[PDB]
Amino acid sequence: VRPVWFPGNPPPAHLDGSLAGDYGFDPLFLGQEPQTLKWYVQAELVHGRFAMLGAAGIILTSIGAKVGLGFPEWYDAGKVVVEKNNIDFPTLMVIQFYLMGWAETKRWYDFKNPGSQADGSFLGFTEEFKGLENGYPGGRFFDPMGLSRGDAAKYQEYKQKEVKNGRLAMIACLGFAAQYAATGKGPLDNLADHLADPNHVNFATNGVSIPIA
Amino acid sequence: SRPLWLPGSTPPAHLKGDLPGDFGFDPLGLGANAESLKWFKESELVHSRWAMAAVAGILVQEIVRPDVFWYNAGKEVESPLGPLGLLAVEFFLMHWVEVRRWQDLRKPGSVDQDPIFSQYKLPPHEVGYPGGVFAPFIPGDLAELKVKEIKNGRLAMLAFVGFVMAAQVTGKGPIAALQEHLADPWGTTIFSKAAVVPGQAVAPPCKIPASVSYKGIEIPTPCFLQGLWP
Amino acid sequence: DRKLWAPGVVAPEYLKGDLAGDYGWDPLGLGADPTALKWYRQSELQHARWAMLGVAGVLVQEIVKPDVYFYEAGLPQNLPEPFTNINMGGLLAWEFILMHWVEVRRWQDYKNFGSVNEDPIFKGNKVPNPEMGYPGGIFDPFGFSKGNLKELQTKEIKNGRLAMIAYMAFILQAQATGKGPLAALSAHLSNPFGNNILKNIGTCTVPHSVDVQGLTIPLTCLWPGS
Ligand code: CLA
Ligand code: CLA
Ligand code: CLA
Ligand code: CLA
Numbered sequence: 312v313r314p315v316w317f318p319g320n321p322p323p324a325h326l327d328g329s330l331a332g333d334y335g336f337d338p339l340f341l342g343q344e345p346q347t348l349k350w351y352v353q354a355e356l357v358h359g360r361f362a363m364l365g366a367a368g369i370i371l372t373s374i375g376a377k378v379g380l381g382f383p384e385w386y387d388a389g390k391v392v393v394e395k396n397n398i399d400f401p402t403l404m405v406i407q408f409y410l411m412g413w414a415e416t417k418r419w420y421d422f423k424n425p426g427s428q429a430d431g432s433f434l435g436f437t438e439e440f441k442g443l444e445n446g447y448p449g450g451r452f453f454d455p456m457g458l459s460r461g462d463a464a465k466y467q468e469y470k471q472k473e474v475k476n477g478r479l480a481m482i483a484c485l486g487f488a489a490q491y492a493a494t495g496k497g498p499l500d501n502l503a504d505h506l507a508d509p510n511h512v513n514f515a516t517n518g519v520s521i522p523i524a
Numbered sequence: 525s526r527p528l529w530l531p532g533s534t535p536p537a538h539l540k541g542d543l544p545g546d547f548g549f550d551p552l553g554l555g556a557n558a559e560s561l562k563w564f565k566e567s568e569l570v571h572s573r574w575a576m577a578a579v580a581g582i583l584v585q586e587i588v589r590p591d592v593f594w595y596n597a598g599k600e601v602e603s604p605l606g607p608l609g610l611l612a613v614e615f616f617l618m619h620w621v622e623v624r625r626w627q628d629l630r631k632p633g634s635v636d637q638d639p640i641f642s643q644y645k646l647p648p649h650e651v652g653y654p655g656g657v658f659a660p661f662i663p664g665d666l667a668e669l670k671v672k673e674i675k676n677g678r679l680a681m682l683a684f685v686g687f688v689m690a691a692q693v694t695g696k697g698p699i700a701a702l703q704e705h706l707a708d709p710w711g712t713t714i715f716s717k718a719a720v721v722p723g724q725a726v727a728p729p730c731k732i733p734a735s736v737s738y739k740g741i742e743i744p745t746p747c748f749l750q751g752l753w754p
Numbered sequence: 755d756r757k758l759w760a761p762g763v764v765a766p767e768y769l770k771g772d773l774a775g776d777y778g779w780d781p782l783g784l785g786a787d788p789t790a791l792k793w794y795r796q797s798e799l800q801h802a803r804w805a806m807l808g809v810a811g812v813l814v815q816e817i818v819k820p821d822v823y824f825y826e827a828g829l830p831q832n833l834p835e836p837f838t839n840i841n842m843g844g845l846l847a848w849e850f851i852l853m854h855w856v857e858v859r860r861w862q863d864y865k866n867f868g869s870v871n872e873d874p875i876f877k878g879n880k881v882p883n884p885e886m887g888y889p890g891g892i893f894d895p896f897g898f899s900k901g902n903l904k905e906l907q908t909k910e911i912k913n914g915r916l917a918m919i920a921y922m923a924f925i926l927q928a929q930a931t932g933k934g935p936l937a938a939l940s941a942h943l944s945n946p947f948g949n950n951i952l953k954n955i956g957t958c959t960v961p962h963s964v965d966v967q968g969l970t971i972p973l974t975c976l977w978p979g980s
């Protein structure tokens with residue numbers, strides 16, 4: 312009675328409709344156990360979060376290119392900011408790994424113990440790192456607008472919208488890499504190449520996607 | 525049965541006409557939390573009052589000094605009291621007032637009394653609405669003025685972004701942009717200056733330099749969202 | 755409801771003749787939901803009325819002047835004398851705001867029927883709106899309603915559907931040969947064997963781009979082949 316990724320086939324038993332963005336897509340039965348599924352919900356969420364941030368990053372910095380601004384492409388922005396700004400690179404990598412190892416191990420021991428990370432062991436914060444549910448921490452820091460409390464039905468709507476935009480941002484970030492490994496130029500240059508001629512500047516005329524050209 | 529932002533609509537359940545200016549407009553659900561709506565009401569009042577003072581300042585500054593331009597007015601003012609002495613006095617004098625207002629927000633029945641003239645105490649007012657000595661000779665109904673302040677303030681919040689996005693596209697103050705729109709209305713709109721079709725995007729050119737000199741060290745002036753413009 | 759679209763067809767259950775122009779149709783199932791059927795009814799009324807305006811514009815602008823051609827009549831070079839070479843951006847701004855008012859008023863008549871009837875500036879007289887898509891009141895300055903509304907409603911829908919097919923004709927008998935509808939009718943009446951659908955389909959007289967004051971519009975036919 313609910314929509315499924317493949318109409319006709321029933322959804323599997325471990326996958327009733329309670330998660331955000333559930334459509335019964337597990338042909339390989341990877342999340343059959345409830346705890347491995349509890350871990351993969353967290354994984355799909357945070358991959359979607361980083362992919363939404365990344366896709367907005369590529370799209371904004373490619374609107375910055377081709378209009379006339381001095382922005383590079385996304386595959387060139389790694390070099391140009393460690394060379395234009397005198398940034399030593401392995402220390403930037405180690406500072407990234409320090410800050411995000413902190414922020415990640417906090418989450419990694421919230422998964423192992425949901426009521427933890429909230430006993431004031433950190434700098435005096437008790438309810439702010441409480442965690443509302445799996446992959447949805449909330450509180451005063453992770454929800455400063457406070458949209459996780461109020462109308463709960465609209466919060467379930469926002470949960471499903473987050474998962475939807477996160478899925479197609481993961482697909483977009485998988486597609487930017489393929490647009491770059493195939494064509495070799497910017498993504499919004501590939502869009503304007505597909506728009507200047509809708510035929511013949513698609514993937515089937517790139518010489519790489521189909522080898523039977 | 526109050527008037528709404530869209531007349532056929534139903535207002536959300538957290539917007540029940542209690543607050544002034546409550547016309548049922550919150551489509552993103554941001555005023556659902558009761559604790560967060562107080563902070564949002566305070567920030568709407570403070571954004572609105574700063575925007576009304578700013579819009580009146582830019583308009584009066586244009587009608588008394590047409591030579592100088594308000595976007596450039598922080599660059600050519602040439603005060604005798606130095607560049608950083610102004611910022612130091614503003615920093616301390618605003619870090620006082622803002623922490624006073626913030627502590628009014630956090631505990632309302634805490635901060636009323638003048639600390640150095642203890643005989644003077646502010647009356648038990650409403651949060652966001654100090655009164656007493658900030659408000660002498662209030663005319664007429666206080667709820668009617670409380671609605672008029674938010675209406676003129678929302679209009680001035682839109683007007684300040686209008687001033688900024690005029691002055692970054694035409695580079696002129698908001699009577700000279702109005703003189704552009706009155707001298708040639710059909711060709712001095714934003715749809716006249718810009719259009720994006722699927723295949724090319726004609727953005728308006730900047731009228732703000734990428735930097736200004738200002739006494740040695742140069743200040744970058746980001747033309748807001750150039751490139752993302754239509 | 756009777757005299758359906760084909761002689762031996764059973765009508766669907768949701769087409770019992772309540773709406774006008776009901777012919778037991780929809781062989782693609784689109785009206786099976788009632789909330790979808792009301793919106794598709796509104797969009798059929800919109801396409802019908804704008805298509806009647808399209809037909810009565812295209813075959814009247816060549817009556818009054820058979821030189822300005824209706825395809826490129828949107829180009830600023832082809833506008834009349836008080837509007838020749840106008841900035842199309844300001845004209846588009848006028849149309850955008852004056853239609854985003856009207857269409858959102860009509861949309862909120864759809865979303866909440868009866869809540870949008872009052873003149874909001876002049877809090878006075880309303881519009882007596884008997885059913886959705888038929889406001890009336892000031893949209894009947896001659897009062898041809900308040901009689902047999904079902905009769906005129908069927909008349910409106912039938913002339914409107916015929917004008918939809920007529921206007922999508924008028925475009926396609928102008929993409930193939932580059933000629934107006936009365937002018938293509940005269941071209942058929944000249945030689946009715948080489949000026950037909952044969953040997954005219956397959957060519958697209960539409961150019962690929964026309965620079966309108968700095969903008970290039972993609973300008974596609976509805977079939978391939980120039
Ligand atoms: C459009 C995608 C989207 C949507 C619908 C949501 C929706 C939700 N998130 Mg989520 N989130 C997203 C993207 C999104 N998020 C991304 C990319 C990140 C990583 C930074 C997060 C990180 C995150 C955390 C850590 C938490 C949530 C929480 C929530 C819930 C309440 C907050 C809310 O209603 O947001 C409403 C969202 C919108 C109205 C849309 C965003 C508005 C603008 C248009 C986005 C513009 C992006 C901009 C260009 C770049 C900004 C980057 C930023 C880092 C400054 C709700 C389920 C909280 C929760 O579940 O509490 C229990 C919570 O704790 N999310
Ligand atoms: C940033 C300033 C600001 C803030 C904090 C608020 C806050 C509020 N408004 Mg308000 N409003 C504002 C500006 C603001 N307004 C302006 C400028 C207008 C005129 C268009 C209005 C018109 C308006 C109406 C008509 C109503 C409200 C209402 C409300 C209340 C409930 C809605 C809510 O949750 O808002 C929370 C909102 C925020 C925290 C702002 C989030 C800003 C996001 C992050 C970015 C927004 C981008 C924006 C689209 C850019 C516009 C660009 C350009 C067009 C200017 C709340 C107290 C309702 C009310 O009074 O009920 C009590 C109501 O009916 N507002
Ligand atoms: C037109 C907009 C407007 C309106 C209707 C109000 C209305 C109100 N304000 Mg408010 N206020 C405004 C703008 C406005 N304010 C601005 C811009 C600021 C920032 C300076 C403030 C700061 C403020 C505070 C701090 C307090 C109020 C209070 C009040 C309430 C009682 C005071 C009163 O009678 O004001 C009536 C207002 C008018 C009749 C407006 C007259 C405008 C004249 C014509 C001058 C305008 C032009 C002038 C040259 C601008 C420069 C002046 C200044 C910026 C240097 C009432 C709800 C008090 C309150 O809530 O008490 C409970 C309170 O404590 N307001
Ligand atoms: C876009 C225009 C449009 C729309 C929205 C409708 C909508 C409707 N028509 Mg209608 N109709 C139209 C044009 C349209 N008609 C035309 C041009 C004709 C003459 C052929 C008819 C003849 C007709 C009859 C005889 C009857 C209806 C009926 C109906 C209703 C039920 C069918 C349904 O749910 O379809 C919903 C439709 C859509 C969601 C639109 C789908 C459009 C598809 C995607 C594209 C069309 C394919 C192709 C391009 C068409 C080529 C046209 C070209 C050769 C000229 C519904 C209100 C029945 C009725 O009145 O019941 C109350 C009925 O008996 N119509």
Ligand SMILES: CC(/C=C/C=C(C)/C=C/[C@@]12O[C@]1(C)C[C@@H](O)CC2(C)C)=C\C=C\C=C(C)\C=C\C=C(C)\C=C\[C@@]12O[C@]1(C)C[C@@H](O)CC2(C)C
Nearest residue numbers: 780781782783801804805807808811812824827918919922
């Ligand atoms: C709105 C419309 C046209 C409006 C045109 C206008 C205003 C034109 C204005 C102008 O020209 C002038 C005046 C003068 C020019 O100088 C300027 C312009 C501006 C160019 C046409 C709609 C035209 C709409 C048409 C033809 C719709 C056809 C749809 C059909 C036949 C679908 C039927 C079905 O979908 C259903 C209904 C049910 C399913 O179950 C079965 C199937 C068959 C799938």
Ligand SMILES: CC(=C/C=C/C(C)=C/C=C/C=C(C)/C=C/C=C(\C)C=C=C1C(C)(C)C[C@H](O)C[C@@]1(C)O)/C=C/[C@@]12O[C@]1(C)C[C@@H](O)CC2(C)C
Nearest residue numbers: 715716717718719726842843846966967968969974975976
């Ligand atoms: C429904 C419909 C609408 C068409 C609308 C168009 C084309 C509007 C153009 C609308 C054109 C517009 C607005 C042009 C606007 C031009 C402007 C602003 C000119 C300018 C500029 C700029 C921008 C360079 C900026 C510069 O600094 C100033 C100035 C002055 O130099 C068409 C449908 C069809 O076309 C399809 C979809 C398929 C076809 O096969 C069949 C049919 C049915 C015909």
Ligand SMILES: CC1=C[C@H](O)CC(C)(C)[C@H]1/C=C/C(C)=C/C=C/C(C)=C/C=C/C=C(C)/C=C/C=C(C)/C=C/C1=C(C)C[C@H](O)CC1(C)C
Nearest residue numbers: 576577579580658659660661676679680683686698701702
């Ligand atoms: C506190 C108190 C208390 C006590 O009791 C008493 C007293 C003292 C009296 C009081 C005070 C008060 C005050 C200060 C007030 C003020 C106000 C204001 C300023 C308003 C404005 C307000 C303002 C406003 C609305 C504004 C508006 C504006 C606008 C729309 C604009 C527009 C524009 C633009 C965009 C740009 C272009 O180019 C042009 C133009 C056209 C120009």
